[model samples]
Target chain A: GTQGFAVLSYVYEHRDLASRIVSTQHHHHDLSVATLHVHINHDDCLEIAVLKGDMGDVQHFADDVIAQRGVRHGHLQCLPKE
Target chain B: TQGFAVLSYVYEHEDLSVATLHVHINHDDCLEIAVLKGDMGDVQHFADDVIAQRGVRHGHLQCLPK
Candidate 1:
């Protein structure tokens, strides 16, 4: 199995979506090693979650988060373990 | 050479942006992931400076060449 890390970045404009995003991470707690949340403004926040685990799962996680309704400018960068 | 890189590290304190995201790991430390894009050599140099800086730890740079 491939093991690596991924950077999942996204932005959202509401608390409802934010909470759901957190829930999503919590549900995949094993894969998430660290999460960075930056408040871009009053209504917008940027989140960058670093995940380490199976590359497939990491990819899936990013797709799921980015697929959420309120997510915008979602991007994923995957780094396979060297 | 032109490409992109994802630089991730745990540091005591940071720059550059293609989108640099930061997380406060604790009172004295931080974890950040910086996505950089530019000349491959330039990106590598930047990563070198960052990864070699005083307060940084676990610095890893994954370069994607294009």
Candidate 2:
């Protein structure tokens, strides 16, 4: 009886590139994209994107995105909804 | 921080495409491996064999432990 949530965070090479990635996510998926938090540290922008969906679907999508060319240090953690 | 080894490898097999593996070390020095299933079995087999090689150290197979 639990839905799944995935937390994906990545550090962008440039701040402008990070904004473009966020915009692309919003355009590509119908899921709501929430900006949980953002931190600019050491010339890098760390952004966290939380996605709510089935475990399998979320994992698959996250994997595909992480496989993309510009994505770096992409970490995804999934937890079942309680 | 506890000391442990984390190995990352890239292996290619004719029958398989690709796979990614993560092995962790706990406080007790126990090993836990988590595999993200790839599309091909050959790739998985290559990964398994690599992890099972002699002197691999603290190798444990945990399949779909979610």
Candidate 3:
């Protein structure tokens, strides 16, 4: 087993979307957002989170987050931290 | 991003002892390889060249890509 980095990015259509996104990260995935980066892309918003954990767990949790209702254009990149 | 593979293995040699290697493949076909060293520079060097072999694709090496 190896520790890995999970970089997740998604876009939301509302301003208060950050809270919901944060909540989903905490409540649904049980992932503590280690870092958060936000960007305004025209009429939409982009939120990026870098999470650290075991590779399997991180990938599983990230998939759950991307499947959420408000999450779109979600992507994840993992780097081994053995 | 969406499609990838995580390859890991442990290698043992007469004088090298034991070491682990972990690699990640990205959707864009980028390959990042990492090797845990066990007091053996030769073994580490071998692994580096292995990752650079033809058809090995885009390879990035980190002594420890944590």
Clashing pairs in 2: none
Scored by DockQ, the top model is: 1
Show where candidate 3 strays beyond 4 Å: A15-33, B1-66
1 or 2, greater by lDDT: 1
- Per-residue lDDT of B10 in model 1: 94
Instruction: Write the number of the candidate with greater TM-score, choosing between 1 and 2.
Output: 1
At residue B38, give the lDDT of candidate 2. Answer: 40
All candidates' lDDT scores? 0.77, 0.50, 0.51
Error in Å for residue A55 of model 3: 1.2
Number of the predicted model whose TM-score against the real structure is largest: 1
Candidate 1: how close is chain B to the reference, as a TM-score?
Answer: 0.84
Off by over 4 Å in 2: A15-28, A37-39, B1-66
- What tens digits encode model 2's per-residue C-alpha lDDT throughout A3-71? 678787776654546445544354343332443333355455565667777776666667766766666
Instruction: Give per-residue CA lDDT, model 3, range A47-68, as digits (tens).
Output: 5666776778777777777776
TM-score of each: 0.51, 0.41, 0.43
